[PDB]
């Protein structure tokens, strides 16, 4: 059954009606299919915005139960070399229709991983077979796509999911499976999602697993932070205040206590402090330059692995030195 | 240094077949082979070290095969060591075999000659008739130094960790069945590494396995297999080695197998001859663990 599947797959939209946050694109595609004027599509966007789900739902709507033999889907997991493009795709696009269901769709998922030769060969396949064949190209990085392929496909940008769409989908998930989510917990979940629905679903599943009895227990912000392990906003505010106001010893003690009470990671703390500082009042540009450069260098050092205490002291010193420029 | 050999296929067909088998086997493994002509016997060696890894083939042919056997040299035991291209000798041997099949009593004469027209490099002047057309072949060959010849040595196999397996004669009632058993695994496309296993208590049984994430091939033998005068003995070997063993088994009768657990495989073939009994020519093939346990 579907109950065994992870929520990221159990709650995969089955129809375009369940797709949220892409209203303009959804309406444009509805009009295209209704008027029978669907052009070559290029869905460009970051991970987990609903490109694969949207195209699958569109294919279901156009055909219905024939989606198996009306659509050819190729992704990175499959071989997509020049030879594959020259034989399999060419054969699929050069054959007549089973039931004259409009056209044949080719979903080149994760096409940004295709080789340049494959794209060059595929451009003329796209151009030659367009009377009864359609192409959809899904990508997260456009610079990996050849300029000609970009020009020959109508581009649709999948923006990060707005807050309202994610709230609606969370409400639908809660209704489907008995569970309660506090407004503060929902706000924290939205903040940590950063416009990714996969993160939303994974965190919700893990938070339900965190709750002892998922029948009468309500998800709270504390549960969300404990499950995700990310710092709470209060900890970030306190550590920033200590760094910007307290002495070196006090700041070191505060940071150590904050990151040892819950075993927090320094990368998350630095990201939170950066986000907080990005919306502060600065009277000098050199302060911002110092903050940005030093913090970016510290994150780069952290990415490679080093001494945790050294990096924490580096963050504290960089912040203190940069903020000394003011006044 | 004088070398003169005379061969007659009509007389003593068994030893002629032995020579054919040795030449074909050496030519089906590598490009060049070592020939040691001694006062008592002729040795044909196919080894990777020339002048797991690939296996080694050693063939010993008694001097009684050749009607005339004149081997004279200044080295001990009048040993003459040569390096010869297997393809040339193999082609000459096909020519002689078809000439004999056409029906003739001609004798093949092999001599060593120096070539000033062309590590001294010499030629083998293989000459035979065909009823008459004179067939002559100057096969290039390289004379090998005494020390270099001494470098090549027969592999040694431990006899305490090894158990011999006696195979049914090819001419017996079980010969065809055992040949089919051997060839069972020579018809699968992607199979490259077979897994031979021997179980003691039919006193003993031999099985061939192929394990894969998708495939599981397993062949048992139910015929009477004897052990030449503890039950876990397995070895992984390439399919080419097993095919070579299969071809070898189809020619000889007293075939013996041995599996040194996770160490190697030994395939021994002997040709009995009546008279005490004459020296028994042998063919020994050593196969190294392709993958191992």
């Amino acid at each position: 059954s579907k109950e065994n599947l992870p929520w990221v797959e159990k709650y995969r939209p089955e129809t375009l009606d369940e797709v949220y946050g892409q209203n303009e694109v959804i309406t444009t595609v509805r009009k295209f299919v209704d008027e029978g004027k669907l052009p070559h599509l290029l869905f460009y966007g970051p991970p987990g915005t609903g490109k694969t789900s949207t195209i699958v739902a569109l294919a279901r709507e156009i055909y219905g139960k024939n989606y198996s033999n009306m659509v050819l889907e190729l992704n990175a997991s499959d071989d997509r070399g020049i030879d594959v493009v020259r034989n399999q795709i060419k054969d699929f696009a050069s054959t007549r229709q089973i039931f004259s269901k409009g056209f044949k769709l080719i979903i080149l998922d994760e096409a940004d991983a295709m080789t340049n030769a494959a794209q060059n060969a595929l451009r003329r396949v796209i151009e030659r077979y367009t009377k009864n064949t359609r192409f959809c190209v899904l990508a997260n990085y456009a610079h990996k796509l050849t300029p000609a392929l970009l020009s020959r496909c109508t581009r649709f940008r999948f923006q990060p999911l707005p807050q309202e769409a994610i709230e609606r989908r969370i409400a639908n998930v809660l209704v489907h499976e008995k569970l309660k989510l506090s407004p503060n917990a929902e706000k924290a979940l939205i903040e940590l999602s950063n416009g990714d629905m996969r993160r939303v679903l994974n965190v919700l599943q893990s938070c339900k697993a965190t709750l002892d009895n998922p029948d009468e227990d309500e998800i709270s912000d504390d549960v969300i932070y404990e499950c995700c392990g990310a710092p709470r906003p209060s900890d970030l505010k306190a550590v920033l205040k200590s760094i910007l106001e307290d002495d070196w010893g006090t700041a070191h003690y505060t940071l150590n206590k904050v990151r040892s009470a819950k075993g927090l990671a320094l990368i998350d703390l630095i990201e939170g402090i950066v986000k907080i500082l990005e919306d502060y009042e600065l009277q000098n540009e050199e302060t911002r330059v110092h903050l940005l450069t030093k913090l970016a260098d510290i994150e780069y050092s952290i990415s490679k692995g080093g001494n945790d205490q050294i990096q924490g002291s580096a963050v504290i010193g960089a912040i203190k030195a940069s903020f000394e420029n003011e006044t | 240094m004088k070398l003169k050999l005379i061969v007659n296929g009509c007389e003593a067909p068994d030893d002629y077949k032995l020579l054919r088998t040795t030449i074909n086997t050496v030519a089906s493994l590598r490009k060049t082979a070592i020939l040691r002509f001694n006062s008592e016997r002729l040795t044909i060696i196919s080894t990777p070290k020339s002048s797991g890894d690939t296996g080694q083939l050693w063939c010993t042919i008694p001097h009684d095969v050749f009607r005339l056997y004149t081997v004279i040299s200044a080295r001990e035991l009048n040993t003459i060591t040569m390096e010869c291209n297997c393809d040339s000798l193999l082609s000459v041997f096909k020519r002689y075999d078809r000439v004999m099949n056409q029906g003739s009593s001609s004798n093949m004469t092999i001599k060593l000659q120096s070539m000033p027209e062309w590590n001294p490099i010499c030629a083998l002047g293989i000459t035979f008739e065909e009823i008459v057309i004179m067939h002559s072949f100057k096969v290039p060959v390289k004379l090998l130094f005494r020390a270099q010849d001494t470098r090549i040595q027969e592999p040694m196999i431990n006899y305490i960790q090894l158990m011999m397996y006696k195979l049914p004669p090819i001419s017996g009632e079980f010969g065809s069945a055992f040949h089919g058993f051997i060839r069972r695994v020579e018809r699968y496309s992607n199979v490259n590494h077979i897994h031979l296993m021997g179980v003691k208590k039919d006193d003993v049984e031999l099985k061939i396995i192929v394990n894969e994430l998708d495939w599981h091939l397993e062949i048992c033998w139910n015929g009477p297999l004897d052990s030449v005068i503890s039950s876990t003995h397995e070895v992984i070997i390439r399919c080419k080695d097993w095919k070579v063993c299969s071809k070898l088994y189809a020619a000889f009768e007293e075939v013996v197998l041995a599996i040194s657990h996770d160490e190697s495989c030994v395939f021994h073939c002997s040709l009995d001859r009546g008279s005490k009994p004459r020296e028994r020519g042998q063919i020994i093939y050593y196969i190294a663990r392709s993958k191992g346990l």
Partner: protein
């Protein structure tokens, strides 16, 4: 209809757009290579595109080959005097019973016979598929065998290589 660079081709050695010094050097080298027992066996001409390598080679052959070519006694293929001053290798020839890599070999093993009464200048401008590793190795081995060959007589061999870059291809 005919393109001018083909219509207005040189009719003599004096119409070739080649400097005097380079022309004299090529003349001397080629004349030396035509001697009964010539020290030099291969003339390797390298240069950019359209610098008149093949043009000057052919123009010099038209004058040199008739001078050294031994007269025949009615052994010519046809009644014509066998106007074959230059023998060139064609890299797109696909005969039936021959592997591709063996094509050039089959050319060279024939080219050796174009000496004395059958004297002809062997020009190699259309190289085999040297981008194939095995083909390139075979070509190098054949050239080495030609250089180290042990025949009393060989025909002059000229290899014209147009030095050019290979654009970065996908």
């Amino acid at each position: 209809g005919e393109q001018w660079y083909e219509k207005f081709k040189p009719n003599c050695l004096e119409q070739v757009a080649i400097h005097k010094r380079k022309l004299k050097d090529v003349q001397e080298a080629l004349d030396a290579m035509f001697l009964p027992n010539a020290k030099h066996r291969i003339l390797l001409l390298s240069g950019p595109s359209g610098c008149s390598k093949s043009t000057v080679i052919k123009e010099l052959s038209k004058i040199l080959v008739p001078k050294y070519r031994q007269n025949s006694n009615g052994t010519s293929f046809r009644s014509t005097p066998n106007e074959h001053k230059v023998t060139e290798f064609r890299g797109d020839c696909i005969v039936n019973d021959l592997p591709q890599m063996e094509s050039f070999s089959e050319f060279l093993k024939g080219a050796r016979y174009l000496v004395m009464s059958n004297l002809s200048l062997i020009l190699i401008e259309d190289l085999p598929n040297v981008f194939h590793i095995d083909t390139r190795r075979r070509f190098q081995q054949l050239i080495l065998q030609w250089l180290y060959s042990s025949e009393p007589l060989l025909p002059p061999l000229v290899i014209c290589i147009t030095e050019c870059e290979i654009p970065e291809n996908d």
